[PDB]
Write a protein that holds these residues in place. Structure first.
Motif, PDB file in Angstrom:
ATOM      1  N   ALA A   4       0.703  -1.159   0.055  1.00 53.88           N
ATOM      2  CA  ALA A   4      -0.094  -0.027   0.032  1.00 53.88           C
ATOM      3  C   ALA A   4       0.828   1.499  -0.177  1.00 53.88           C
ATOM      4  O   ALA A   4       0.677   2.046  -0.890  1.00 53.88           O
ATOM      5  N   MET A   5       1.706   1.180   0.797  1.00 53.92           N
ATOM      6  CA  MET A   5       2.568   2.514   0.808  1.00 53.92           C
ATOM      7  C   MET A   5       3.265   2.539  -0.831  1.00 53.92           C
ATOM      8  O   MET A   5       3.318   3.736  -1.424  1.00 53.92           O
ATOM      9  N   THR A   6       3.740   1.712  -1.459  1.00 51.63           N
ATOM     10  CA  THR A   6       3.856   1.708  -2.982  1.00 51.63           C
ATOM     11  C   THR A   6       2.781   2.187  -3.651  1.00 51.63           C
ATOM     12  O   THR A   6       2.889   3.215  -4.554  1.00 51.63           O
ATOM     13  N   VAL A   7       1.630   1.672  -3.428  1.00 51.69           N
ATOM     14  CA  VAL A   7       0.687   2.367  -4.278  1.00 51.69           C
ATOM     15  C   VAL A   7       0.322   3.499  -4.119  1.00 51.69           C
ATOM     16  O   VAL A   7       0.012   4.629  -5.058  1.00 51.69           O
ATOM     17  N   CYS A   8       0.413   4.243  -2.851  1.00 48.62           N
ATOM     18  CA  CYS A   8       0.238   5.506  -2.753  1.00 48.62           C
ATOM     19  C   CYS A   8       1.284   6.578  -3.590  1.00 48.62           C
ATOM     20  O   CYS A   8       0.959   7.289  -4.309  1.00 48.62           O
ATOM     21  N   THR A   9       2.477   6.007  -3.366  1.00 51.48           N
ATOM     22  CA  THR A   9       3.442   6.554  -4.083  1.00 51.48           C
ATOM     23  C   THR A   9       3.346   6.636  -5.825  1.00 51.48           C
ATOM     24  O   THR A   9       3.924   7.341  -6.601  1.00 51.48           O
ATOM     25  N   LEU A  10       2.961   5.501  -6.383  1.00 56.62           N
ATOM     26  CA  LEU A  10       2.703   5.169  -7.696  1.00 56.62           C
ATOM     27  C   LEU A  10       1.595   6.189  -8.041  1.00 56.62           C
ATOM     28  O   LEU A  10       1.548   6.655  -9.142  1.00 56.62           O
ATOM     29  N   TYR A  11       0.635   6.530  -7.267  1.00 52.37           N
ATOM     30  CA  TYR A  11      -0.204   7.239  -7.602  1.00 52.37           C
ATOM     31  C   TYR A  11      -0.008   8.492  -7.971  1.00 52.37           C
ATOM     32  O   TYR A  11      -0.037   9.137  -8.857  1.00 52.37           O
ATOM     33  N   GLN A  29       3.285   9.916  -9.010  1.00 54.07           N
ATOM     34  CA  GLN A  29       3.750   9.985 -10.251  1.00 54.07           C
ATOM     35  C   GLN A  29       2.824  10.312 -11.430  1.00 54.07           C
ATOM     36  O   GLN A  29       2.965  11.127 -12.439  1.00 54.07           O
ATOM     37  N   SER A  30       1.912   9.443 -11.270  1.00 56.17           N
ATOM     38  CA  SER A  30       0.866   9.360 -12.301  1.00 56.17           C
ATOM     39  C   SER A  30      -0.088  10.706 -12.394  1.00 56.17           C
ATOM     40  O   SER A  30      -0.905  10.826 -13.256  1.00 56.17           O
ATOM     41  N   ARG A  31       0.162  11.434 -11.488  1.00 55.92           N
ATOM     42  CA  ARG A  31      -0.497  12.898 -11.818  1.00 55.92           C
ATOM     43  C   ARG A  31       0.637  14.136 -11.790  1.00 55.92           C
ATOM     44  O   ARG A  31       0.171  15.214 -11.972  1.00 55.92           O
ATOM     45  N   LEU A  32       1.696  13.502 -11.830  1.00 60.94           N
ATOM     46  CA  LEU A  32       3.094  14.559 -12.232  1.00 60.94           C
ATOM     47  C   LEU A  32       3.038  14.221 -13.557  1.00 60.94           C
ATOM     48  O   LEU A  32       3.498  15.192 -14.176  1.00 60.94           O
ATOM     49  N   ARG A  33       3.314  13.186 -14.118  1.00 62.92           N
ATOM     50  CA  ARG A  33       3.824  12.700 -15.432  1.00 62.92           C
ATOM     51  C   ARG A  33       2.636  13.306 -16.488  1.00 62.92           C
ATOM     52  O   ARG A  33       2.799  13.818 -17.514  1.00 62.92           O
ATOM     53  N   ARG A  34       1.561  13.185 -16.251  1.00 61.57           N
ATOM     54  CA  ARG A  34       0.126  13.704 -16.937  1.00 61.57           C
ATOM     55  C   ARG A  34       0.304  15.425 -16.605  1.00 61.57           C
ATOM     56  O   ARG A  34       0.122  15.995 -18.012  1.00 61.57           O
ATOM     57  N   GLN A  35       0.678  15.904 -15.553  1.00 62.24           N
ATOM     58  CA  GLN A  35       0.848  17.350 -15.580  1.00 62.24           C
ATOM     59  C   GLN A  35       2.007  17.763 -16.367  1.00 62.24           C
ATOM     60  O   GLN A  35       1.945  19.077 -17.046  1.00 62.24           O
ATOM     61  N   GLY A  36       3.024  17.117 -16.346  1.00 63.23           N
ATOM     62  CA  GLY A  36       4.406  17.690 -17.025  1.00 63.23           C
ATOM     63  C   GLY A  36       5.640  17.285 -16.248  1.00 63.23           C
ATOM     64  O   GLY A  36       6.854  17.010 -16.789  1.00 63.23           O
ATOM     65  N   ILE A  37       5.743  17.265 -15.017  1.00 61.23           N
ATOM     66  CA  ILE A  37       6.840  16.955 -14.218  1.00 61.23           C
ATOM     67  C   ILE A  37       7.079  15.560 -14.360  1.00 61.23           C
ATOM     68  O   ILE A  37       6.481  14.982 -13.972  1.00 61.23           O
ATOM     69  N   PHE A  38       8.378  15.242 -14.734  1.00 58.80           N
ATOM     70  CA  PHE A  38       8.845  14.106 -14.654  1.00 58.80           C
ATOM     71  C   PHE A  38       9.788  13.733 -13.553  1.00 58.80           C
ATOM     72  O   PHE A  38      10.770  14.246 -13.161  1.00 58.80           O
ATOM     73  N   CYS A  39       9.524  12.616 -12.893  1.00 59.56           N
ATOM     74  CA  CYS A  39       9.846  11.904 -11.713  1.00 59.56           C
ATOM     75  C   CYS A  39      10.695  10.877 -11.804  1.00 59.56           C
ATOM     76  O   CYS A  39       9.943   9.972 -12.372  1.00 59.56           O
ATOM     77  N   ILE A  40      11.936  10.391 -11.369  1.00 58.19           N
ATOM     78  CA  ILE A  40      12.330   9.126 -11.593  1.00 58.19           C
ATOM     79  C   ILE A  40      12.521   8.524 -10.199  1.00 58.19           C
ATOM     80  O   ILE A  40      12.653   7.112 -10.195  1.00 58.19           O
ATOM     81  N   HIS A  41      12.490   9.056  -9.123  1.00 59.46           N
ATOM     82  CA  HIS A  41      12.740   8.262  -7.840  1.00 59.46           C
ATOM     83  C   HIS A  41      11.420   8.694  -7.024  1.00 59.46           C
ATOM     84  O   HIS A  41      11.317   9.795  -6.517  1.00 59.46           O
ATOM     85  N   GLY A  95      -6.031  13.655  -4.837  1.00 56.04           N
ATOM     86  CA  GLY A  95      -5.842  14.896  -5.435  1.00 56.04           C
ATOM     87  C   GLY A  95      -5.212  15.854  -4.475  1.00 56.04           C
ATOM     88  O   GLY A  95      -5.639  16.222  -3.327  1.00 56.04           O
ATOM     89  N   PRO A  96      -4.578  16.946  -5.362  1.00 58.49           N
ATOM     90  CA  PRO A  96      -3.933  17.911  -4.728  1.00 58.49           C
ATOM     91  C   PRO A  96      -5.160  19.124  -4.504  1.00 58.49           C
ATOM     92  O   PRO A  96      -5.973  18.826  -5.040  1.00 58.49           O
ATOM     93  N   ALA A  97      -4.613  19.892  -3.616  1.00 60.58           N
ATOM     94  CA  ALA A  97      -5.636  21.139  -3.567  1.00 60.58           C
ATOM     95  C   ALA A  97      -5.187  21.994  -4.444  1.00 60.58           C
ATOM     96  O   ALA A  97      -4.367  22.086  -5.491  1.00 60.58           O
ATOM     97  N   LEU A  98      -5.810  23.325  -4.323  1.00 62.10           N
ATOM     98  CA  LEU A  98      -5.706  24.446  -5.272  1.00 62.10           C
ATOM     99  C   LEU A  98      -4.889  25.859  -4.627  1.00 62.10           C
ATOM    100  O   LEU A  98      -4.395  26.462  -5.196  1.00 62.10           O
TER     101      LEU A  98
END
Length: 973
Positions: A358-365, A367-379, A793-796
């Motif tokens: 579960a901890m890994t699933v939280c972090t994988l989620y 990345q998947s709203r940064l890579r869609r947003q534009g910011i690319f993360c590798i760690h 999701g993140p806030a505004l």
């Protein structure tokens, strides 16, 4: 020999020093203040040869008499005459002597085949527990939950398998390439040797046609301007001098480095240039930088340090359950092997065997709203560090300002008058002013784009005429940096004679101009511009009927204006950062007063605030505290920072707590500025791509690199948006992903424990829970809730409050314990109430545990229990301060409601073949049962809110202490 501990290794790495000292007895030993583990030697080549590598430096020392470490050039007190005494190449006997001490000029990587990698990844002390749990469940259960935990772990090891191989494959497709480059021999030969077989002691004769680079050398004879694109960021040809006779770091421009693609290769003394070798590919510049990112810094986060400590409290709450459980489970006279398998299941029910997933699933989620947003993360685990940032240090070239220059226009002069700045040079009519700067260039009109210097491209499109009425006649003087000007002789049809259109630096050219043309208001207009952060050059002309006859008693037409404008989206972001109580800093490799007018513009130093220049002087004298007028901030310089870091180290923490603008920063002087601010106990963040970013970027905590799509020479955040609009939405993705790593960890601890309580309130009376039931609970209600939960999701709007980051503190522990007194309570209240009921008959105890199952205590405890897991999950996921309100998570609400409905149905109606429930409950107190579950719902939400208000009325991080201290007594006296 006879000291091997292999007989004691076949009967079993917590302390590496207490184990290697027993398995082995100045020979093969390495222990000095850092992890004590690199134990090998070679001692080949018929010499001493202290060989041992640690991360790529051999440390060639066995003693102090005939040995001395730090093999990087080994002769730091060297003479500049010595490289001029050794212009010739090293002799072929001695060439295979210096190769024996130094490296083979290849910074290589291991191959690391699959058995190896696997072993490493698996023999870790959690995946052993997921090989003890699966081998315990399979004795009974399993099949379904075991297959699922094993599959989830396999994909958890095959993803780290292919991700770590690709990191090696990408670095292998990098440097350690091969290239034939001729040398000077012992006596006048070339032989075209390879670029990976040269040592310090040889030379280089580089071919002017082509070659990437072999190595870093000292230019004993020659002069060139190499391509510095992969070294210092500036892709322009940088002027690199020869080494004068009489410390290679001081002679930076006198020595050429590795990766230098040659452009000029100007000999000017003879046929070819001569450059003698300084280092080798192991410990050179960019040879060390690629090896630096192979051994990264550990993410020393206190959240994970309390996450591997709270499980070790669940690893002792098991041992206070598996002693009681043996006693109770035996008193009821089980035949034995089941007592053992049962106490062991209690151990796997209270230490959750998929908490890691579960901890890994939280972090994988994440990345998947940064890579869609534009910011690319590798760690992935670096993202959690992004929310707890209290300092963000910026660059300025391509980070806040625009990278290239532009123009505001020309400020002409007709008879010492200073007619004002024109906004667009086509508006004022045609004359000598706009024929000049549109043509005064040496640009290369080649393949549809003029290619040359950056700043002179923008002056062509400013008024935008055609190009080839005039034509480029002759460039009598090409632009050298010694004269600071360039004259262009040009004519056009409609004229009788050509004119000497010339641009250059203002004071040096206008003094050569006619004094009847240049006025006495030339100095005052100069510092009216260059003190406001402007680049300024002057333009002159003279008619012509070569030599410097074209440059003498000129007619100075006017001044030219250049400046680096800000990006349109860097002003409303610096206001957005320091309104949220985290403070921004620029680090700067440009001039000071250039980088002050930027900080007054964008919003580092706000208007109606003070700022003080610090200039402390080589000599250890005073500070002189220069002010400016136009909280507290203060700007300082590059060499000023080198003085007060060593001459006043006890005075340094009262300067970096207030330092906003750091100008003239060297590319290595930045990486302690991002490190002195880490032992002031901040949590820094670098954000900038440009020339000098490389050294301080990885040493920071969260390093963002702009204007590049996907690259691995980076700190693990690399946006592809080319603005600092990403640095809010990286510190906003570390708050909705660190206040999610509470809400998944807490639901998990709470589930494990509601299951422990139920299995226990139910090992007593000898009525162990059943298999489909445990499966339903775990798989359904815990794979759905965890997975679906981690995607709110993140806030505004960024807040003035940070997430806590410490999950051993009282609030987490207190919520778990109170929510738990309410859970035990609802499960036990239920058992006692089912008992005192008048139709009730007891369980046939003197049979067995899993053939005692069409009964009642298990039905009541399992129903009250499932509803509890879903209610605790909805309670432990709140989104008022940080993430988002819960009703925007549609999948979750829909699941909570549908699972809840299948469960209400099991209670108020039929799943009685499966799930082993009581055949039917006749009376209508299934309703009190439903009421006890409603009391528990209201209960959890209310308790969590009341506890959320916890003002325990009953400043240690250093920065905080200083600030208080300074506030009392300021320090710029």
């Amino acid at each position: 020999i006879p000291l091997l501990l292999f007989r004691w290794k076949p009967l079993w790495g917590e302390g590496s020093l207490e184990p290697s000292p027993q398995s082995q007895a100045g020979a093969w030993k390495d222990t000095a203040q850092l992890h004590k583990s690199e134990e090998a030697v070679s001692v080949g080549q018929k010499r001493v040869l202290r060989y041992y590598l640690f991360q790529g430096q051999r440390y060639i020392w066995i003693e102090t008499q005939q040995a001395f470490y730090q093999v990087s050039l080994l002769d730091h007190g060297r003479s500049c005459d010595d490289v001029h005494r050794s212009r010739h190449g090293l002799s072929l006997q001695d060439q295979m002597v210096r190769k024996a001490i130094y490296g083979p000029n290849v910074i290589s990587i291991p191959v690391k085949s699959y058995p190896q990698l696997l072993v490493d990844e698996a023999l870790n002390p959690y995946y052993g527990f997921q090989a003890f749990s699966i081998a315990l469940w399979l004795a009974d259960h399993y099949y379904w939950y075991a297959l699922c935990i094993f599959l989830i772990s396999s994909i958890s090891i095959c993803l780290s398998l292919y991700k770590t191989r690709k990191q090696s494959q990408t670095l292998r497709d990098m440097v350690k390439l091969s290239m034939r480059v001729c040398v000077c021999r012992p006596g006048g030969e070339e032989e075209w040797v390879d670029s990976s077989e040269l040592v310090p002691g040889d030379c280089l004769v580089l071919p002017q046609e082509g070659g990437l680079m072999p190595c870093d050398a000292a230019l004993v004879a020659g002069e060139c301007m190499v391509n510095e694109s992969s070294l210092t960021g500036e892709s322009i040809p940088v002027l690199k001098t020869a080494l004068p006779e009489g410390c290679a770091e001081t002679h930076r421009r006198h020595t050429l480095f590795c990766g230098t693609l040659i452009l000029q290769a100007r000999a000017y003394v003879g046929p070819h240039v001569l450059a003698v070798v300084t280092r080798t590919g192991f410990c050179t510049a960019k040879g060390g930088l690629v090896s630096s990112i192979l051994h990264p810094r550990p993410i020393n986060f206190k959240f994970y340090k309390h996450s591997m400590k709270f499980v070790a409290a669940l690893s002792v709450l098991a041992l206070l359950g598996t002693i009681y459980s043996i006693f109770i489970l035996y008193r009821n006279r089980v035949p034995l092997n089941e007592i053992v398998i049962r106490a062991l299941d209690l151990v796997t029910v209270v230490v959750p065997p998929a908490l890691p997933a579960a901890m890994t699933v939280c972090t994988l989620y994440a990345q998947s709203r940064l890579r869609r947003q534009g910011i690319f993360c590798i760690h992935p685990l670096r993202i959690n560090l992004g929310g707890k940032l209290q300092l963000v240090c910026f660059d300025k070239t391509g980070t806040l300002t625009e990278d290239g220059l532009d123009v505001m226009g020309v400020v002409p002069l007709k008879g010492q008058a200073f007619l004002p700045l024109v906004p667009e040079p086509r508006r004022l009519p045609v004359g000598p002013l706009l024929r000049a700067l549109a043509t005064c260039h040496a640009l290369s009109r080649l393949q549809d784009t003029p290619v040359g210097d950056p700043m002179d491209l923008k002056m062509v499109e400013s008024t935008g005429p055609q190009l080839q009425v005039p034509v480029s006649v002759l460039h009598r003087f090409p632009f050298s940096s010694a004269l600071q000007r360039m004259s262009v002789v040009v004519a056009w049809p409609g004229a009788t004679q050509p004119e000497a259109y010339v641009k250059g630096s203002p004071e040096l050219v206008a003094g050569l101009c006619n004094p009847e043309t240049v006025p006495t208001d030339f100095a005052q207009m100069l510092q009216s511009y260059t003190a406001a952060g402007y680049r300024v050059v002057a333009l002159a002309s003279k008619p012509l009927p070569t030599r410097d006859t074209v440059e003498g008693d000129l007619s100075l037409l006017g001044l030219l204006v250049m400046r680096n404008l800000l990006k349109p989206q860097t002003t409303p972001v610096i206001q957005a950062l320091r309104r949220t109580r985290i403070r921004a800093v620029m680090v700067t490799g440009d001039n000071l007063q250039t980088a002050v007018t930027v900080a007054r513009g964008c919003g580092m130093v706000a208007p109606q605030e003070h700022l003080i220049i610090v200039h402390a002087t080589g000599q250890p004298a005073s500070l002189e505290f220069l002010p400016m007028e136009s909280s507290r901030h203060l700007a300082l310089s590059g060499p000023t920072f080198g003085i007060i870091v060593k001459h006043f180290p006890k005075l340094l923490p009262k300067v970096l707590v207030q330092g906003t603008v750091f100008a003239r920063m060297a590319p290595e002087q930045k990486t302690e500025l991002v490190c002195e601010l880490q032992k002031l106990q901040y949590c820094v963040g670098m954000c900038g791509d440009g020339a000098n970013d490389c050294g301080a970027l990885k040493a920071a905590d969260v390093g963002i690199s702009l204007s590049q799509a996907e690259a691995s020479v980076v700190s693990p955040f690399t946006s592809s948006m080319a603005s600092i609009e990403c640095v809010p939405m990286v510190i906003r993705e570390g708050r909705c992903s660190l206040d999610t790593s509470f809400s998944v960890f807490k639901y998990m601890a709470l589930y494990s424990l509601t299951q422990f309580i139920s299995v226990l309130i139910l090992y007593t009376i000898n009525t162990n829970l059943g298999d489909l039931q445990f499966l339903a609970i775990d798989l359904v209600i815990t794979t759905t809730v965890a997975v679906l939960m981690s995607r709110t999701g993140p806030a505004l709007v960024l807040g003035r409050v940070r997430p806590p980051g410490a999950l051993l503190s009282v609030p987490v522990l207190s919520s778990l314990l109170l929510q738990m007194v309410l859970v035990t309570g609802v499960q036990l209240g239920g058992y006692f109430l089912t008992l005192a009921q008048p139709w009730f008959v007891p369980l046939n105890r003197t049979v067995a545990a899993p053939d005692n199952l069409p009964n009642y205590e298990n039905t009541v405890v399992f129903s009250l229990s499932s509803f509890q897991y879903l209610i605790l999950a909805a309670a432990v996921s709140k989104g008022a301060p940080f993430r988002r309100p819960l009703y925007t998570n549609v999948p979750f609400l829909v699941a909570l409601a549908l699972l809840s409905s299948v469960l209400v149905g099991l209670v108020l109606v039929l799943l009685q073949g499966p799930l082993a429930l009581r055949n039917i409950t006749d009376t209508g107190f299934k309703l009190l049962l439903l009421g006890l579950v409603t009391l528990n719902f209201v209960g959890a939400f209310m308790l969590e809110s009341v506890l959320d208000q916890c003002l325990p009325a009953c400043s240690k991080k250093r920065f905080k202490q200083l600030e208080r201290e300074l506030a009392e007594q300021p320090w710029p006296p």
